[PDB]
Design a protein around this ligand. Structure first.
Ligand SMILES: [Mn+2]
Ligand SMILES: [Mn+2]
Ligand SMILES: [Mn+2]
Ligand SMILES: [Mn+2]
Ligand SMILES: [Mn+2]
Ligand SMILES: [Mn+2]
Lengths: 170, 169, 169, 169, 170, 173, 173, 170, 169, 169, 170, 169
């Protein structure tokens, strides 16, 4: 209900600590990093690169809630992959749908992308169902795609198109 | 209105420009490069300090409150033309400052930069703004079809111009 | 016409581009920066090699003769638009190539770059050119007043556009 | 087929890669950056020489004729996967080299790089290619909707994979 | 009042004052023949030309260190031994009789320290009182430049006036 | 003859010629307001100012590509829209009547391509023939600069002469 | 008094003082043969020449750390083993008898630490009191340079005075 | 012979000749007050000081382009308007009467082009014939520098001789 | 003596080093380059931070008072030798520290750096110092004639060495 | 012991690392480059930030006291091996933390980095350390003769290893 | 017998092709490379680095025979690892012992190292025996150290000391 | 002997210097940095072109054959001293050139550089060389014990000097 006070803002240098705290292997523009020091240098290097865009999510009190990321952005095919990360202490408060809507809205009314896709573990059917409710549809079931917790797991690939998100209600 | 001033934009004004871009909530550009992050804006600012293709001015009142921004872009010094954009901070909209800012901009453009022509774009769906520009002496020279993707759809804009010869009489 | 090809511009083609600019005898630009000397053109070329705001193609025949140039400029990948200019070498003007080149340019723009809109400027005093563009599907969206200083006086130009939806159907 | 060899790509092979890109006539990429001119390709090459994310092999015969190219991209060394593309030079298409190249690539991927999975994309509108990949042991894991803008329209592609366990048994 | 006016070499800390002088005057200002508007541009042009001898500047102060004005020598040529001189007095100090004193300080510097041969200046034809003041200080008209400067919405004529080292020293 | 004179933008390969022109004249030459003497200094000043718009130069060639002379615009200011012009003809081509043609080419460029408002030049007071030539091409004296230049052992006066875009373009209208 | 004068190598924090000394003297000052006027130019010339051995400078302080003056060696050549010396005392400390002491410190440094062979200086012909002071410290006139320097509106002559290491070190032996 | 001698600005292609002149002369040579020995060092000092105006050099050629000598102006000061002059004639061209002509060319350049006020030079006290030649060309002794230069195993005295622009021009 | 420690020199110690050089009143060197100003010393320090030809240590007591400096220079890792210099601050001279410092330096040189030989120079006119070095195991290997210009005249110095084999037994 | 944690090393930890190196009092290395001063360590740190060959973890308790350091060096990601060193701060030596740290390191090495082998070196003259490692599951694979010059003499060290298969069963 | 004509020379840029041909995963200063282009850049980067030293082996006719490498050189411990690689076409001609002697001689009479060690596959007992003949002694048997041909293999670590190689005959 | 000349070393002589180092077969240094590869020598050469601490001269005959090298190193311009080394190419040894080269070097050192003292090192085991130096006026000032590791063992060298005052009489 009280998701009204969540704001998105473009990621900046001061947010790197938070990003570092969030990851428990991460990448910055497809380059791996572990230390905050490496992340700092990778950040300076890619500041003008348009292949990935990030937004930190804050509440009215400026607490850092989570992160919205678009990666693999291609401006000819007009597509991007989307990932959302909510800080542990803010999980389970119902913010996810709101953040997903903000991300799609940005992608489809500002960047003018045509398609957005994402990956979700097959073993997290609750998350899969949440994405289906937000209008995503399964386009793939990737077999043994990611090595997580000691074994290769399958993931769903789900997408939504700009035409669908914008004209859903017409 | 009499106490509104223009001053050349400086690094310390960038936070304000960044705030104007967040509230406005469309993609903003610095020397034709889109920016989102304050850090990207700051780097684009340092890179183009010596570039004359765009010039910007902040608008302040007698008390130094930041009112808005005046921008000249696509400046070409052979054809002597430029595009003009004006942005008033939300809290200062509706107070009658617009005409004043437009006059300041034209005055600068035509009595200091010595430009020949100034043009601007205004949404077709904002006929009040179109009418305001017509009152300040601008005339429609084009109706650009599906020129800008704004708020989820391609929109048409009027292109309006005024010439130095007209303004200087 | 069937044997005309477009190929991405390369450093070795700059001599040709420079020759086209001399006979045309108007101020030429490379990424919105004016140039006159071959050396300035070469340096602007090296500087903008990775810049996606402009794309150029040389036109060749089956025998590799250099026919002309196709340029897309002001490319904006959010609004998905670009401005188009075409230049045919003097000795190849009047051979019927223009329509073919225009089609190749639109095809590239709309089936490879995935742009939404392409526009161009054409002198009002060249109504034959205007008519040719109308035949290829372009429509006037503006009549720009005293937009360009050409041959000693400010001239009006038509601004003409075509949309991807129209060209693809 | 027995006499086909793979060799790690070097700067001298860039001409060949550029030639392959012209015939295919869709936008090509070098480490996810698009390029059209040989000059752009050469610069992107110098820039990514130390980058592990993509690896390429040129295919030659006993006489050193250039047959084609094998590319692994989006290589991830933790998940141990990569995307595979194969490009055969026009003059060598239809001669039965494809299956051999595919086998060489899988062998390399699975017995030398020690990858776990190899996947590829194939246009839904090219069912003969899809069928060939199914014969080589690939299986469909996705049907990507309107994934790529190719020839004026968004097209669907199949995503097909093969696992190291399957190929090695 | 006038005996206590001093010239001192312009320094980085004075640029704010120079910027304020440019805002009040409200015509396009130049630094090493490059126009500037923003304080940032002025500061970068200042850093870039610190070792360039084609222009030299001095701030004018009183006994209490109030900033009175600026003296500039530009187009300095050390073979022909000439330079252009410009003087700008802050609004609040105009009309107080400082000008003649500043002009003499500038000529003294030019002719007894830099060893220049000639100093010239430009003065609007529409400011005959200024022209006459320069004539009183020993300058003579050598040209009447037609529509030389676009100032305040129109091309204006300016007098070009000069004085020679031999005249000022004898 | 004069119909066949062409202007082209100066390029690096023309610098030898420019250097030769400077040696014959035998007075101090400048490139972007910096004096130069050696070819090497000229070449480095050329590389340094390639993208600087305050000066523009053109070499003059005939139908056979012989190098005839040089046209320079300096002190170009794009707000006031003015520039200084200098023309130099190679010794062996002086006295063939090319000057007026080159002056027309320069004015035409300045006023129909760069869109400048005013062009001025300096001419030695002791070269009244040159002053007269400039007056015929439409220039008018706007100053007589006293002891402006140290040339050949003494300070000399020069005329400053100008012409406006309105006059050159619309004289006939 | 003079026993308590110390020399120390010039440092960045002393540049304000050097700048103040230049303003009072009111003639053109140089740093590594480059003239400077603003503090900012002096600071950049200082940063640029930090590792340049052609000039060396020392500030003079008293027991209380007040800044008294400056000792400079310039044109140092380590093959010919010579250098030019200049000494500048702050106005408020002139006339207290410090000069001879500073000159001795400078000679001592030059001849017992740098191992130079010769030290020379310039003194205005119109400052015969200074010339006499230098003669007392062991310097001898080796030239009377005619119209060498343009100072205060006219070319002035200066004496050039020198002293050799052998004389300063072994005079007493 | 002498009417056909020309001065031209030194260029990179002349450095081999300058290096040969330094080897034959067999004393330590300087470029912008820095000693050089190797051609490589000379070439780097040349590149580094191309835009430095404190020294200017000219090679002397005959009608057939044979390299005759070198004319150098050093310690050029554009406020006091003075410079030091050095002339070096290639061994095979010494004794042919070129010197006076070269000296006049150098003074002419200095005084009718650079607009200098004074030119001075150094000449070994042990070469009174050279001293006398300079006196004939209008130079006057202004100093006798004691043990100024360590040359050929010993400190040597040199005369310092000067000439003024007013004298040479009148 | 037991409470004297050696620690690797750091930027914050440069003031102390500079103070030692002023009272000693002879030309000092940093990596064979002479210095006088603190600023020159600081720049030489930044430049040679990774240079292994010289190593320095400050000597402190239990209370962290700065006692002196130990320097190894001309370090050659093939011949395995180095030159040693030791400087004790004026106020700490005559307290018996010298022998202790010499032992610490040799210990470092021979048990950590693994050098084979350490040598030093000592003025012939300081026979007390020479005798102290002989007591610590050094032996004269040369009497260098007029090696150093010090206090207005060329002075002879003894060169004294000790070998790792001797110190370790 | 239960409350000991490992945390990836950062720039702010360099002081601590430098303190550990002073107490050990033998030559220390950062990516195989020796260092003594904090300044050298800081420069070597900046230089190797992107280098994968060594990884470090600081050990803290619940209250954030700095206990020690765990280092993996000579990491090879193909052969999947690394050399391990552990350093405990003097004040925490002898309190029983060692075995716990060793277990944490093996666990990390074998369940997170997926290494195959971990080896270490231990002085032959420190048989209690050797015995402790044998108890933790390491086995001698070499006795390296006169491998390290430590405290004035070349000393032998045991090389001890443990394999992932052994630790995980 | 005719090993007398083998020469060692320090590796230089032109030898990189040969080094590239020799490797069938290699490293340059412990940094991995595959392409010749990467090797070129790594070469430029480490030219002044003393941690590794390489020598190419040539015959009288300048054929490239092989490579001698010292790596992990530490100048405090005074040790290094040695590797020798003979080009396929030159294997089996008896050159190895000669190259090993050249390497030890260099290491022990020029670099002044104290110890040299090497690694040899346990499954290549012929090579192990050759090294024992040249004076090396086993100091370790590394268990499952290297993944070669589809499985982890054991390797011997063998060393020789300077004192032994130099005084063997006394 | 009369026709032997010195000339300042230049880049084109480096191959010769490299050849001299290969035949001599001991570790060579350039500005105290050891070099082996021609590429390392070339980079050290470019780096120290402006460094005055060492000066070198090649020796040529009338026919331009390269005879040898004269080097002054450790040049100090305050103490006015330098170390001298001379190397004659193998094929030119034994022809009586040595005395001549020594005289050329001393002459340069003492009549051009104005040095005060020149010293050199000569193996104790080469008494013929020692005697030659004594004949040219040098005197032993030291017998350095185990100073250089040459040919597998530490060797002693004589240090010999001569002063400018002596040579200039
Ligand atoms: Mn990707
Ligand atoms: Mn634009
Ligand atoms: Mn100017
Ligand atoms: Mn000087
Ligand atoms: Mn290692
Ligand atoms: Mn040394």
């Amino acid at each position: 209900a009280m998701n009204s006070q969540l704001t998105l803002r473009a990621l900046e240098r001061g947010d790197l600590r938070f990003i570092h705290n969030l990851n428990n292997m991460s990448y910055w523009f497809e380059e791996p990093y572990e230390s905050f020091d490496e992340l700092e240098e990778l950040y300076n290097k890619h500041i003008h690169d348009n292949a990935e865009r990030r937004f930190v999510v804050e509440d009215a009190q400026k607490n850092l809630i989570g992160l919205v990321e678009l990666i693999e952005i291609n401006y000819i095919h007009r597509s991007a992959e989307f990932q959302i990360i909510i800080a542990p202490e803010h999980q389970g408060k119902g913010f996810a749908r709101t953040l997903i809507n903000r991300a799609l809205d940005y992608s489809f009314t500002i960047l003018n992308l045509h398609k957005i896709y994402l990956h979700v573990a097959v073993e997290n059917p609750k998350a899969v169902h949440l994405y289906e409710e937000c209008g995503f549809v399964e386009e793939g079931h990737l077999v043994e795609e990611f090595f997580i917790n000691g074994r290769y797991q399958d993931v769903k690939r789900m997408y939504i198109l700009q035409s669908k998100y914008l004209n859903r209600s017409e």
